[PDB]
Curated annotation (Swiss-Prot), chains A, D:
Role: Capsid protein self-assembles to form an icosahedral capsid with a T=1 symmetry, about 22 nm in diameter, and consisting of 60 copies of three size variants of the capsid protein VP1, VP2 and VP3 which differ in their N-terminus. The capsid encapsulates the genomic ssDNA. Binds to host cell heparan sulfate and uses host ITGA5-ITGB1 as coreceptor on the cell surface to provide virion attachment to target cell. This attachment induces virion internalization predominantly through clathrin-dependent endocytosis.
GO molecular function term, any single one: structural molecule activity
Lineage of origin: Viruses, Monodnaviria, Shotokuvirae, Cossaviricota, Quintoviricetes
Any one GO cellular component localisation term in the record: T=1 icosahedral viral capsid
UniProt organism field: Adeno-associated virus 2 (isolate Srivastava/1982) (AAV-2)
Residue stretches spanning the membrane: none
The protein's name in its UniProt record: Capsid protein VP1
Keyword presence, Hydrolase: no
């Protein structure tokens, strides 16, 4: 840091600049940090009797952490539109981080009034691990983001983690991390903190949608030179006999043509409808779910593999867990009606990824003979096969930007299943805490742990700046594209704006896929 | 009140042993338990389960 | 008949772990026994008591 | 090594040269090495029921080892006399070691005859640890030395060791060493082996005897100026009363004088006589012994601390274990008469070290008063106190030259208790073995350990050369010294010489202490 109590440690920077090829964004927010857990660590675990699936064991810490991982932190609704309408892809490159204008307040709750005053000599300490030595919590899509709207103020969320358990009990291999055991940087009023970071090379995210379905790749005018088996028998006299005929596949045969490629893999979902009348009356929620089984307990696959949500001309149906779901403004935690949630749509991927609610295809179950008749069965789960292409899941406007790839001997197509960018060395976790200030010890000496501290909290401003790389488009498409538009009719409230009471709200999910490409 | 800091530099002596078979090492037990050794409990009091000496590796007399 | 010889060079990866508590280590049992593990018996036949894997030290996922 | 089957790999060197200050010795012997344990390791331990003192656990190996550690290897009886008569002390400095003229023989025992023939391509492998990684056996005064007489041939003794036990069972800490796991050097006919070694600095051994006893240090002619308490009471009238008188100590008082020094420590022994009539009739051997108690078992202290053997004008008595004992020529292992053994004498140390069969002194047990009378008791064991001087035990002609000081956090006056030179890095153990040659395997493949080998053994010549450092004498003694002399009377056999059947023998033990010094 630098200088005094009266001097300011940083300016407010929130802006976006568009350079053409690369592009740069900036934002600044205001935060407040409480003391958590009365300055002490605690182990936490599952509560008494619980399902074998719900057991957990871990620790909670006094430390907080910053999360900018959602897009809406970085991009405004309009800045989001020189991106998704004008471009075929984007990726991050490098970022900056800064804290400044730190001030610490102590509070006195005596009687029915609470007085608050500056504590000028108190400190707040911050570090960034950057060696990836801690359990990495970010990327699990928790709350506690920097707000989407720059004028809001937010608390910093508390930090904690989980470790191997058996039931509600720990195992010998289970690990315990003390955050005090790292070098950090102690800051007072008039001290600031910075670091900078560089993304590893990662593929552009695909903001295009395809103009060709994988099942139609070819010229309708010209027939193939390959033959397929067409008729298996022919009438002879009164009744048929076995005769094999072959054919070349034309535009009337398009079903039957040879191809060089296959659709992507599927792991199948249950289908439900937004119209309440079509759905069965029972509780199938947990029973009818698709799950995976790991170490004797069952977990839902909430996003699951990337698959189209519905087929043509059914907009009413979506996979049970297969989609992301966002809440509207002020929605509650539990048991809330469908009118409150916002359900995203995965469609444009129909052309490669198969629909999530249907089988991959059909396969032959048996060997035919004279007295046996051919039999097939549906394959509801398919792994990856050579010659198989697919697309990934869209990032939308608000959702995960990145995730940390687990450190393991093998992995396949690491792009993460919620969306965004898989990173082996992602942006490091930033951790922050209030330094404990003891209160009025006894006159005689005693060896005991202090239970008594001054009650205080801190606040300041944080800033983030990321540099993005863009991919422009050369398209010879003659006719116009599909663009993201706001409706021009009159309305009581404007979208993406404060209401009369001053609560900013986001009307609908906005994906990145509009501009079209050929497959 | 304030903060204090201490840093000590230590000198180590490595081992060359031609012992064929394995040594005795200090191990934590791998069975399940309510509390992990050398860790906070649910109320946040750090505790040390047992004394730990320095003598494990073996030498010839 | 004759003698054969082999020499291999290996590359190692050390560990930086902020785990506070102790690890699990591979230990020989310290109780008394008739025969020492991984050693000749009274008739001179070398034997290996148990399989020994490489996975002890712990990492975060 | 070098050159051929027909070329010789070394000359015979046995000689002694006397340079004045630093003196050099050399010797060469001929050895034969069997295969031990059929080329394999075996664990050994105590046999079934045995005293808790006699339990042991350990291993025996196919390997042999060379031991030159006794003096009589290096010095001839006459060379021993330009040393002990002419000098006040000597110590080793550096040594050399060499093997050469190696030849390997295979034997065929079929029928009642045994044919022996050269195996020219067989090997013998040798190494020297020199990092002190193995259990160190030498210094325990075992058999298997290079012979005292240069024309004799000897086997190489087998190597083995012991480790921690509980009863006859091993403990988890117990260690197992494979000698194959060291780098060694494989030698055929026409290959030789050498290494050289340098002794660490060590004090000269004291070959002088003292001309003054510690109890008499002072001028008989002159009285002291200090007073001692002489008479405790005086007659008054008919009966005595308490009156304290003091006196200065003269030549008539020599018992009572003040001194600056005290005699060395003692750990007391039982006394026996060479005349069979004085000794008690019972078995007191193990019961009347002096012992130390370590980990629940009892061990005799065979040499024990250094103490004089007998007082003036008793030559008949010696400590029970307190002396070294040598056997005459051809004496057997067990239950042999006193006429067969040779008992060494520790006397010249009377002047400092106390006699081994008597108490150190007397000490006051109680506080006197009018109605209580002074009481004392004998102290049979004394540790070291400030102001205490002593001598070490003599090396004689045949006995340990050195021992290895144990590697420990503390030790006191490391000179070893049998005699000679304590060394932290002594001359390293030399180890030698015959390389196994398999015999005629079966035609089909089998995975099993070979039980069948060619039967063979090897032989050659070994050589040792040590450099010694001498300490000459400047003595103003007017009259003649005591010298070591051979008796000039006629006899059937000459001392230290072959008899009519050709067996070399040593008549008596010969110590190093003749020349006299003032205390
Ligand atoms: N986000 C992200 N990171 C890395 N790889 C990705 C990603 N998304 C898809 N893939 C696929 C395509 C790359 O060629 C391949 C490299 O994996 P590996 O060798 O890194 O993984
Ligand atoms: N043979 C031998 N080696 C070493 N010290 C001996 C020996 N004999 C007697 N001492 C005594 C006298 C030395 O000053 C002292 C050094 O012990 P420390 O410090 O080696 O130990």
């Amino acid at each position: 840091g630098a200088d005094g109590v009266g001097n300011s440690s940083g300016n407010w920077h929130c802006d976006s600049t568009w350079m053409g090829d690369r592009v740069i964004t900036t934002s600044t927010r205001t935060w407040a940090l409480p003391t958590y857990n009365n300055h002490l660590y605690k182990q936490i675990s599952s509560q008494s009797g619980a399902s074998n699936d719900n057991h957990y064991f871990g620790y909670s810490t006094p430390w907080g952490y910053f999360d900018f991982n959602r897009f809406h932190c970085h991009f405004s609704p309009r800045d989001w539109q020189r991106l998704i309408n004008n471009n075929w892809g984007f990726r991050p490159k490098r970022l900056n981080f800064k804290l400044f204008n730190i001030q610490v307040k102590e509070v006195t709750q005596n009687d029915g009034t609470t007085t608050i005053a500056n504590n000028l000599t108190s400190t707040v300490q911050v570090f960034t691990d950057s060696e990836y030595q801690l359990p990495y919590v970010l990327g699990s899509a928790h709350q506690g983001c920097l707000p989407p709207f720059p004028a809001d103020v937010f608390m910093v969320p508390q930090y904690g983690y989980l470790t191997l358990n058996n039931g509600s009990q720990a195992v010998g291999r289970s690990s315990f991390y003390c955050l005090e055991y790292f070098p950090s940087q102690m800051l007072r009023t008039g001290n600031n903190f910075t670091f900078s970071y560089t993304f590893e090379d990662v593929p552009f995210h695909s903001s295009y949608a395809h103009s060709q379905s994988l099942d139609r790749l070819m010229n309708p005018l010209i027939d193939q030179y390959l033959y397929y088996l067409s008729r298996t028998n022919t009438p002879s006299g009164t009744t048929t006999q076995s005769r094999l005929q072959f054919s070349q596949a034309g535009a009337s045969d398009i079903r039957d043509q040879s191809r060089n490629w296959l659709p992507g893999p599927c792991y199948r979902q249950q289908r439900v409808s937004k119209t309440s009348a079509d759905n069965n009356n029972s509780e199938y929620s947990w029973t009818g779910a698709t799950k995976y089984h790991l170490n004797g307990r069952d977990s839902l696959v909430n996003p699951g593999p990337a698959m189209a949500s519905h087929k043509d001309d059914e907009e009413k149906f979506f996979p049970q867990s297969g989609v992301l779901i966002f809440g509207k403004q002020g929605s509650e935690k539990t048991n809330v009606d469908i009118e409150k949630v916002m359900i995203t749509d995965e469609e444009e991927i129909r052309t490669t990824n198969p629909v999530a609610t249907e089988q991959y295809g059909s396969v032959s179950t048996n060997l035919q003979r004279g007295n046996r008749q051919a039999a097939t069965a549906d394959v509801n789960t398919q792994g990856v096969l050579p010659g198989m292409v697919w697309q990934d899941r869209d990032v939308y406007l608000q959702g995960p930007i990145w995730a940390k790839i687990p450190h393991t001997d093998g992995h396949f197509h690491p792009s993460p299943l919620m969306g965004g960018f898989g990173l082996k060395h992602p942006p490091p976790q930033i951790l922050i805490k209030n330094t404990p200030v003891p209160a009025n010890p006894s006159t005689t000496f005693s060896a005991a742990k202090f239970a008594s501290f001054i009650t205080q909290y801190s606040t300041g401003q944080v800033s983030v700046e990321i540099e993005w790389e863009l991919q422009k488009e050369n398209s010879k498409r003659w006719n116009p594209e599909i663009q993201y538009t706001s409706n021009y009719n009159k309305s009581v409230n404007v979208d993406f704006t404060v209401d009369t009471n001053g609560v900013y709200s986001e009307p609908r999910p906005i994906g990145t896929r509009y501009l079209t490409r050929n497959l």
